[PDB]
């Protein structure tokens, strides 16, 4: 099940209006209380006149709007369904702005749900812009529209939340597309719950950012429940989806062709183990005990080019274990892993333990040192997030999570580790004074500037339960080494949610729950556009523009000439990102020295070193003087 943010608003003096009713099926049947009437469009005799559909109200008075609920027709009937829709909201009923939520309703009976931050609104409006199975029809059994408690402005300079992207799925996982830059989102062999798998299935569910359309597909070519999995873009562009579910697969998405091709099944059926990219292209993985046995899982690496995974009995998982209280089921997953100089993988934690993993031969691990302070050895901090910000000096941001996967207490430590070479032990300070809030199930994503967007998570960690919720997200500044609390949401991101960096510089943030007959699925995504895409008035600021690069495809240590419209000040690529059960091995960033041609004409190098510079696809994001970024041009990396 699913449930609204805020609570239901009386509808008794309601003005209702619709854009055509079959007698029987008045407008008014969706707010008479009863779940056996309802209204319908015209059909039969009255011709059946296709969508779009709308149904408006006026409820008399300014509410404080944070949603609507749609219930369909009960009878058993599916005509009518709402697929594809968006939500608009008005003081005056004549200027009706854009969506406060768009996107599309799963194809079945059940209550939908549209969750917006709160909205100070008069009328509400419901455009049905398809029928779930394309039919011409639009029918409600119960339309209610939520308030909250009560509104406040978001406040200036903090950045701004929405839309809300309605989705049929929970989207547990999710990766942008680097080619087409759509989000494609996964969740298990259905739309909202894991348990009782068949295995061999999963549903995908996209959004295209620049159409604003959500679409849903299964997907069973590969074999696979890909729920629970490791990820990794590989240096063929190919994203490798490693177990979970069904423990021993390998799934490639191919970004260019929009399609799931069958991988080699891994030498060790895993679930919840992270994966990360290496120098060379190749995919290494370890750990991963929620699924496929709990036993010690040590290292192992795919090749893309043989199609081959080889397991590193040498590259020992033993290192890297919490002390979990759930014991080894939980100790070996989500290892913040980042792939490094010749063919090493650098763990940062979760454990306190940090290591070094060579692949090498059969393999190898050597201790890095602990995660620590002048404020002491930092405690295992399961689900807490690890980013790399600026791959060039080696720096990774770590903050939050707890000293066991559940029932723990989150923690506000937050430390900045920076890498030199492979088997040193790198030096580890605190961050700032901390996170503003501890959290765990937290999600987080680099940003063109080099500061990391941190959202969602709850204190405590209760899987399944939006409890203790973080609403306020934080940003790092590296240059000031402070934390800034950004605007609040009002959705809870805690677990199975995911965020994203969008090629056009804002911040997809969606999903929490997957947890079938619970109310705590979220079936849905909010958009976070930062303040750097806004000028001193509040509204969207120009945005300078990339108008040529002189290659889209380019050899670590090669070189890319770009022209503007434009003066530019910064620049930076961000190797596109991945993301599940808060782990993203994929995204970093490399800030880029940038040389003046004149003519508005520029250029940089891509670092040499392939440990730093991951090949796989990258954006480049130029700024100008004032801040703002471009959308991103996608670039591949290769080596
Ligand atoms: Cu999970």
Same mark, same amino acid.
Not at 172 to 198: C, K
């Given at each position: 099940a699913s449930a609204p943010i805020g609570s239901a608003i009386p509808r008794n003096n309601w003005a209702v209006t619709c854009d055509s009713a079959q007698?029987?099926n008045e407008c008014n049947k969706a707010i008479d209380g009863n779940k056996?009437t309802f209204w319908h469009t015209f059909?039969?005799?009255? *011709?059946?006149p296709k969508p779009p559909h709308t149904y408006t109200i006026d409820m008399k008075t300014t509410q404080n709007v944070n949603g609507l609920s749609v219930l369909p027709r009960q009878?058993?009937?599916?005509?009518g369904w709402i697929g594809r829709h968006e939500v608009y909201l008005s003081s005056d009923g004549t200027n009706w702005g854009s969506p406060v939520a768009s996107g599309s309703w799963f194809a079945?009976s059940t209550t939908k749900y549209s969750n917006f931050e709160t909205r100070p609104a008069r009328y509400v409006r419901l455009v049905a812009i398809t029928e779930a199975?394309?039919?011409?029809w639009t029918s409600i059994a119960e339309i209610n529209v939520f308030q909250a408690s009560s509104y406040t402005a978001p406040?200036?300079?903090?950045?701004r939340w929405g839309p809300t992207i309605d989705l049929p799925?929970?989207?547990?996982?999710?990766?942008?597309?680097?080619?087409?830059?759509?989000?494609?989102?996964?969740?298990?062999? =259905?739309?909202?719950?894991?348990?009782?798998?068949?295995?061999?299935?999963?549903?995908?569910?996209?959004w295209?950012? /620049?159409?604003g359309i959500v679409?849903?597909?299964?997907?069973?070519?590969?074999?696979?429940?890909?729920?629970?999995?490791?990820?990794?873009?590989?240096?063929?562009?190919?994203?490798?989806?490693?177990?979970?579910?069904?423990?021993?697969?390998?799934?490639?998405?191919?970004?260019?062709?929009? /399609?799931? $091709?069958?991988?080699?099944?891994?030498?060790?059926?895993?679930?919840?183990?992270?994966?990360?990219?290496?120098?060379?292209?190749?995919?290494?993985?370890?750990?991963?005990?929620?699924?496929?046995?709990?036993?010690?899982?040590?290292?192992?690496?795919?090749?893309?080019?043989?199609?081959?995974?080889?397991?590193?009995?040498?590259?020992?998982?033993?290192?890297?274990?919490?002390?979990?209280?759930?014991?080894?089921?939980?100790?070996?997953?989500?290892?913040?892993?980042?792939?490094?100089?010749?063919?090493?993988?650098?763990?940062?934690?979760?454990? #306190?333990?940090?290591?070094?993993?060579?692949?090498?031969?059969?393999?190898?691990?050597?201790?890095?040192?602990?995660?620590? /302070?002048?404020?002491?050895?930092?405690?295992?901090?399961?689900?807490?997030?690890?980013?790399?910000?600026?791959?060039?000096?080696?720096?990774?941001? #770590?903050?939050?999570?707890?000293?066991?996967?559940?029932? /723990?207490?989150?923690?506000?430590?937050?430390?900045?580790?920076?890498? *030199?070479?492979?088997?040193? %032990?790198?030096?580890?300070?605190?961050?700032?004074?901390?996170?503003?809030?501890? =959290?765990?199930?937290?999600?987080?994503?680099?940003?063109?500037?080099?500061?990391?967007?941190?959202?969602?998570?709850?204190?405590? *960690?209760?899987?399944?339960?939006?409890?203790?919720?973080?609403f306020?997200?934080?940003?790092?500044?590296?240059?000031?080494?402070?934390?800034?609390?950004?605007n609040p949401n009002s959705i809870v991101?805690?677990?199975?949610?995911?965020?994203?960096?969008?090629?056009?510089?804002?911040?997809?943030?969606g999903?929490?729950?997957?947890?079938?007959?619970?109310t705590?699925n979220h079936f849905d995504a909010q958009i976070?556009t930062?303040?750097?895409?806004?000028? %001193?008035?509040?509204?969207?600021?120009?945005?300078?523009?990339?108008?040529?690069?002189?290659?889209?495809?380019?050899?670590?240590?090669?070189? $890319?000439?770009?022209?503007?419209?434009?003066?530019?000040?910064?620049?930076?690529? $961000?190797?596109?990102?991945?993301?599940?059960? #808060?782990?993203?091995?994929?995204?970093?960033?490399?800030?880029?020295?940038?040389?003046?041609?004149?003519?508005? %004409?520029?250029?940089?190098?891509?670092? %040499?070193?392939?440990?730093?510079?991951?090949?796989?696809?990258?954006?480049?994001?130029?700024?100008?003087?004032?801040?703002?970024?471009?959308?991103?041009?996608?670039?591949?990396?290769?080596?």
């Open positions: 007698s029987g056996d059909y039969g005799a009255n *011709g059946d009878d058993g009937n599916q005509n079945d199975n394309g039919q011409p406040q200036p300079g903090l950045g799925i929970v989207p547990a996982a999710a990766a942008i597309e680097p080619t087409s830059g759509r989000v494609l989102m996964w969740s298990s062999y =259905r739309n909202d719950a894991f348990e009782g798998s068949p295995g061999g299935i999963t549903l995908t569910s996209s295209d950012p /620049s159409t679409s849903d597909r299964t997907s069973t070519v590969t074999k696979h429940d890909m729920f629970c999995p490791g990820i990794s873009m590989d240096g063929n562009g190919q994203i490798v989806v490693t177990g979970g579910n069904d423990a021993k697969k390998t799934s490639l998405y191919d970004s260019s062709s929009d /399609s799931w $091709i069958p991988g080699p099944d891994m030498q060790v059926a895993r679930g919840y183990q992270s994966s990360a990219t290496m120098s060379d292209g190749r995919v290494f993985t370890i750990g991963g005990s929620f699924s496929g046995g709990r036993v010690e899982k040590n290292g192992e690496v795919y090749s893309p080019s043989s199609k081959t995974w080889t397991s590193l009995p040498n590259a020992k998982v033993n290192p890297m274990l919490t002390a979990d209280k759930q014991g080894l089921y939980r100790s070996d997953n989500h290892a913040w892993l980042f792939g490094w100089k010749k063919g090493s993988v650098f763990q940062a934690g979760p454990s #306190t333990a940090m290591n070094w993993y060579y692949t090498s031969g059969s393999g190898d691990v050597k201790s890095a040192g602990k995660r620590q /302070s002048n404020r002491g050895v930092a405690p295992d901090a399961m689900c807490g997030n690890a980013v790399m910000y600026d791959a060039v000096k080696g720096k990774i941001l #770590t903050f939050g999570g707890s000293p066991d996967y559940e029932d /723990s207490d989150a923690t506000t430590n937050a430390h900045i580790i920076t890498l *030199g070479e492979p088997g040193t %032990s790198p030096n580890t300070v605190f961050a700032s004074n901390g996170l503003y809030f501890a =959290r765990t199930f937290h999600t987080s994503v680099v940003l063109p500037d080099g500061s990391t967007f941190i959202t969602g998570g709850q204190r405590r *960690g209760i899987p399944t339960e939006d409890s203790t919720p973080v306020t997200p934080e940003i790092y500044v590296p240059e000031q080494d402070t934390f800034y609390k950004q991101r805690a677990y199975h949610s995911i965020s994203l960096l969008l090629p056009d510089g804002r911040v997809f943030n999903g929490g729950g997957l947890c079938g007959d619970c705590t976070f930062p303040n750097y895409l806004y000028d %001193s008035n509040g509204n969207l600021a120009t945005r300078p523009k990339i108008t040529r690069t002189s290659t889209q495809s380019v050899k670590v240590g090669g070189r $890319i000439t770009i022209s503007t419209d434009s003066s530019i000040s910064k620049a930076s690529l $961000i190797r596109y990102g991945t993301a599940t059960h #808060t782990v993203n091995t994929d995204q970093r960033r490399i800030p880029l020295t940038l040389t003046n041609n004149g003519g508005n %004409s520029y250029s940089f190098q891509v670092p %040499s070193d392939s440990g730093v510079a991951l090949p796989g696809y990258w954006m480049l994001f130029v700024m100008n003087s004032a801040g703002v970024p471009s959308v991103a041009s996608t670039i591949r990396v290769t080596q």
